[PDB]
């Protein structure tokens, strides 16, 4: 039905290439390189606090928006106190864009962070794992002709009446949610259908994360 | 329970002062002046198209974000073809901020637009009403101690674990939705509770709009 050849609830091929704890994630034609770096400093408003911080650099205005989202989402699944007074720098570089870059950056950014925290734990730098849960993000939408779709590519994102990015944890809770109706609107029923699809795709991404980790 | 004196599902006092089709909306201590202006031109990518446009100026980076949201939300409930080839300029000025400015601007921006379109119809400039439905927006959230709250003031917005802005039409459909978990997360149950409260408040705002109009 989709020009893609995919079913409405089918994810594009996902690849988590770890070949630095650099991560190259591929979703169809979308590709993003994600890197996590640890520094034993923290923003001034935290110095002395004994609690860590996570922040991200992202490249491909609205850029700041995505950098802030990445920092937020990660902080939601990391006990900053257990991390100690140090900050984790995440850096994403979109090398190929074909829809879903923002959510693909989050998924990739998580793994990269997981990899850096693993070395922190193995180095004896921190006593316990601070990651409270797995995290992944996906985009969903409503196309005027094929209905609800999961993981939109460029062309689909472009012509969708309803666009939505969802970030959830492995335990199935929300970290962040955002849906916009173009010159269109969506009902409660549509919202429930969109969140179900999104959850299906996010559970699949997290399954892959666990297995690559 | 709230330092406000309000119940968890109670809106702050709402005022739509029409004393130019200028609108001054007041929500508790939040106050925003909204103005709608009509111009018989349209962005270049539309010239000749015969379809209108709505855009907004907003003042108090993230400013652009709010201006774009205002333009989006309005466009969702207006048949741009019936408006003709002309654009509606909305201008919001936050004169007092105590939480919920962004959603209060949307509600105020809608009325102002409604007022300008009414004159367009009475002037004989357009044959039919282009407004497809009423629209209002409200903020909801989850506070670590009082649970789910409706219409957050500054202090509450500040310490809420979960923040969320919702825009809906009078017919009860979604135009825009955005919820963020700080260093916290919200369940499906939380999401349903948050959307119910939001809908209660939005229905109340729209009731007031209808009666002021």
Curated annotation (Swiss-Prot), chains A, B:
Record Gene3D superfamilies: GHMP Kinase, N-terminal domain
Protein's UniProt keywords contain Disulfide bond: no
Keyword set includes rRNA processing: yes
Classification via Pfam families: RNase_PH, RNase_PH_C
GO terms of biological process kind: rRNA 3'-end processing; rRNA catabolic process; tRNA processing
Note: Sulfate ions in the crystal structure may represent the inorganic phosphate substrate.
Annotated InterPro entries: ExoRNase_PH_dom1 (IPR001247), ExoRNase_PH_dom2 (IPR015847), ExoRNase_PH_dom2_sf (IPR036345), PNPase/RNase_PH_dom_sf (IPR027408), Ribosomal_Su5_D2-typ_SF (IPR020568), RNase_PH (IPR050080), RNase_PH_bac-type (IPR002381), RNase_PH_CS (IPR018336)
Family in the record: Belongs to the RNase PH family.
Enzyme class, UniProt record, top EC level: transferase
GO molecular function: 3'-5'-RNA exonuclease activity; RNA binding; tRNA binding; tRNA nucleotidyltransferase activity
Protein role: Phosphorolytic 3'-5' exoribonuclease that plays an important role in tRNA 3'-end maturation. Removes nucleotide residues following the 3'-CCA terminus of tRNAs; can also add nucleotides to the ends of RNA molecules by using nucleoside diphosphates as substrates, but this may not be physiologically important. Probably plays a role in initiation of 16S rRNA degradation (leading to ribosome degradation) during starvation. Plays a role in the secondary pathway of 23S rRNA 3' end maturation.
Chain sites annotated for binding phosphate: 62, 100-102
E.C. no: 2.7.7.56
Protein name as catalogued: Ribonuclease PH
Disruption phenotype: Correct processing of the 3' end of 23S rRNA no longer occurs in the absence of mrnC.
Subunit structure: Homohexameric ring arranged as a trimer of dimers. It has been suggested that the active form is the dimer which binds tRNA and that the hexameric form protects the substrate recognition loop (approximately residues 65-82) from proteolysis.
Keywords, in A-Z order: Nucleotidyltransferase, RNA-binding, rRNA processing, Transferase, tRNA processing, tRNA-binding
Organism per entry: Bacillus subtilis (strain 168)
Catalytic reactions on record: tRNA(n+1) + phosphate = tRNA(n) + a ribonucleoside 5'-diphosphate
């Amino acid at each position: 039905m989709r020009h893609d050849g995919r079913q409405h609830d089918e994810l594009r091929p996902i690849t988590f290439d770890l070949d630095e704890g650099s991560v190259l994630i591929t979703a169809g034609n979308t590709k993003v390189i994600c890197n996590a770096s640890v520094e034993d400093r923290v923003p001034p408003f935290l110095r002395g606090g004994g609690k860590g911080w996570i922040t991200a650099e992202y490249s491909m205005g609205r850029t700041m928006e995505i950098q802030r989202l990445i920092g937020r989402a990660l902080r939601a699944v990391v006990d900053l106190e257990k991390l100690g007074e140090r900050t984790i720098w995440i850096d994403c570089d979109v090398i190929q864009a074909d829809g879903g870059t923002r959510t693909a950056s989050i998924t990739g950014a998580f793994l990269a962070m997981a990899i850096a925290i693993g070395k922190l734990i193995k180095a004896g730098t921190i006593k316990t794992n601070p990651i409270t849960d797995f995290l992944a993000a996906i985009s969903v939408g409503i196309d005027k002709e094929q209905g609800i779709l999961l993981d939109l590519n460029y062309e689909e994102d472009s012509s969708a009446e309803v666009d939505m990015n969802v970030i959830m944890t492995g335990s199935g809770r929300f970290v962040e949610l955002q849906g916009t109706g173009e010159e269109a609107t969506f009902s409660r029923e549509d919202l429930n259908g969109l969140l179900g699809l999104a959850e299906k795709g996010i559970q699949e991404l997290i399954d892959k994360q666990k297995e690559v980790l």
